[PDB]
Amino acid sequence: TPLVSEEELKLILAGAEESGAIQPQEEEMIHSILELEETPVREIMTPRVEMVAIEDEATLEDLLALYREHRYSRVPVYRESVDHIVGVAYAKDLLDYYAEEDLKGRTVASITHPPYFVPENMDAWSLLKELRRRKVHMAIVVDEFGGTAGLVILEDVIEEIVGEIY
Amino acid sequence: SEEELKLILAGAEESGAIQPQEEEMIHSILELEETPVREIMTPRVEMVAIEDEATLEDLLALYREHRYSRVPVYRESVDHIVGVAYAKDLLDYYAEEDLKGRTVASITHPPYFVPENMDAWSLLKELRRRKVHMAIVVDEFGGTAGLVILEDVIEEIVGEIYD
Ligand SMILES: CC[C@H](Sc1nc2c(N)ncnc2[nH]1)C(=O)O
Secondary structure, eight states, X not given: OOOOOHHHHHHHHHHHHTTTSSOHHHHHHHHHHHHGGGOBGGGTSEEGGGOOOEETTSBHHHHHHHHHHHOOXXXXXXXXXXXXXXXXXXXXXXXXXXXXXXXXXXXXXGGOBOOOEEETTOBHHHHHHHHHXXXXXXXXXXXXXXXXXXXXXXXXXXXXXXXXXX | OHHHHHHHHHHHHHTTSSOHHHHHHHHHHXXXXXXXXXXXXXXXXXXXXXXTTSBHHHHHHHHHHHOOSEEEEESSSTTSEEEEEEHHHHTTSOTTHHHHTOBGGGGOBOOOEEETTOBHHHHHHHHHHHTOSXXXXXXXXXXXXXXXXXXXXXHHHHOOOOO
C-alpha cells in the first residue's frame, strides 16, 4: 500500500534488521543490491599494482608456473607493458594440452581470449549486467587516459552482494 | 515486520524507488528461504562421477571428455560418495610420472551432504560458513539425489551466469 523512496527503504531495512524480522545477513545482502548502483568498479577491482599479468610471447609452461606460484586461475595478457593489454588467458585451458611436451611448445598467445575494457568509473550494477551476458567474467578497468587501472571479475561483484567465499 | 518488508519492497518498485530488475533480485533473496535444493540440484542421472581409486590420468581424461571441473568422487556405487575432486588441482601435478602414480583420492576433498529438502538460504549459509563450493544432496535413505554448487544459488539470486 504505502509509497516510499530509496532512502526511506534503506532506513526501514535498518529498522527491520534491528527488529529481527529479517536476518542481519539477508539485510546486508539486500542493502548490497541497493549499493551496487553506487559502487564504481574502482572500489572493488584488483588494482594494476597487485595484479598478475603475463606476456603474449611467453610459453604455456610459463603460464603454468605462474598459476602454481600466484594461484590465479585467469591472467591478463599484455605485449609491451601492462598498459597494452592484448587479451586474457585461463589456467584451466592448460588442461586441454597438459602435456609436458606440448606446453613449452606454444605461446600464451595461442590460448588468449579477446579483452573486455570498462572505464574506471562504471558502476558494479552495470558491470554485473555486462559481465553476466558474456562468456568472459573478467574485464580490464581502464584509467581516463587509456592506461590499465586494474582488473575486475564477476566473483567480486558476487562477493559484494553475498560476502567472501573462497 | 516480515510481511511488511515483503510488501513495501513491491511498493518501492511502484514508487520509482527500485527498478523491476532490482526488485526481482530482492524477491529472489527473499524466496531463497522457501526454495529446496531439489529444485536447483543436478540429479544423479545427469551427474559425472569418478572412483577414488582411479588415476589422475583417468581424472584428466574424464575432464577432457566431459568438461566438468568438479567431480563427486565415489567408492563402490555413486550412492557411496567419499568426496569431491577439483580438476584445477591436476595443474599441480607432473605430467609424465605424477599422474600415473597418484589416484583421485589424493586430491579429493571431504564431502558436504545436505538433505534433499534443505532450503537455499540455509544451503548458502552453510556453504559460506564451511567454505565449501559443492554439496551432495542425499535422499531419505542415504542415496544420492544429486549435486548442487554455490553458483546455482547465486544464479538463483542474479540470473543465469554463462561461462
Ligand atoms: C560452473 C561450474 C560447473 S560444476 C559441475 N559439475 C558437474 C557434474 N559432475 N555433473 C553434472 N553437472 C556438473 N556441474 C562447471 O565447471 O561446468
